[PDB]
Amino acid sequence: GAMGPTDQDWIGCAVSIACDEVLGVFQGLIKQISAEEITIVRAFRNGVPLRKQNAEVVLKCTDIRSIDLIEPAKQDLDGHTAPPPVVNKPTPVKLPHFSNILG
C-alpha cells in the first residue's frame, strides 16, 4: 500500500509499463494483478496496436523497470458538474475562440 501497489483495487485501471530495452514499452488496462506479475488486456506496444488485440499481456515485475497509473478508476460520479471534455485527456491542439456551433 505505502509502496509497490499490488491489489485487486487497481483492476481495470489504465496504466503504462516501461520494461527493459529488450521488452520495450506497452500500455493497457489491468485485468489481474499479483505480487509476481501484472496482467492487462488489449496490448498496445511501441505506440502501435499489437496484432493480438484480444490476447492478454503478462509480464513479471522483475522484468519491468517502472510503472505509472495514467487513469485511476473513477470515484466521483460527477453529475454533469463540469463540461463533458476533461483536461486529463490528451490535447493535440487548442481551439482558439469558440466555434459558431457548440457540440
From Swiss-Prot:
Protein name: Enhancer of mRNA-decapping protein 3
UniProt function note: In the process of mRNA degradation, may play a role in mRNA decapping.
Ranges for region Disordered: 75-97
Lineage: Eukaryota, Metazoa, Ecdysozoa, Arthropoda, Hexapoda
Mutagenesis or variant effect for F44A: Strongly reduced interaction with DCP1A, but no effect on P-body targeting
Gene: Edc3
Cell compartments where the protein resides: Cytoplasm, P-body
Subunit structure: Forms a complex with DCP1A, DCP2, Me31B/DDX6 and EDC4/HEDLS. Within this complex directly interacts with DCP1A, DCP2 and Me31B/DDX6. Homooligomer. Interacts with Gyf.
Protein family according to the UniProt entry: Belongs to the EDC3 family.
Organism: Drosophila melanogaster (Fruit fly)
Impact when changing Q27A: Strongly reduced interaction with DCP1A. No effect on P-body targeting
Region (Required for P-body targeting and interaction with DCP1A) residue spans: 3-103
Every Sm domain range: 3-73
Domain of life per record: Eukaryota
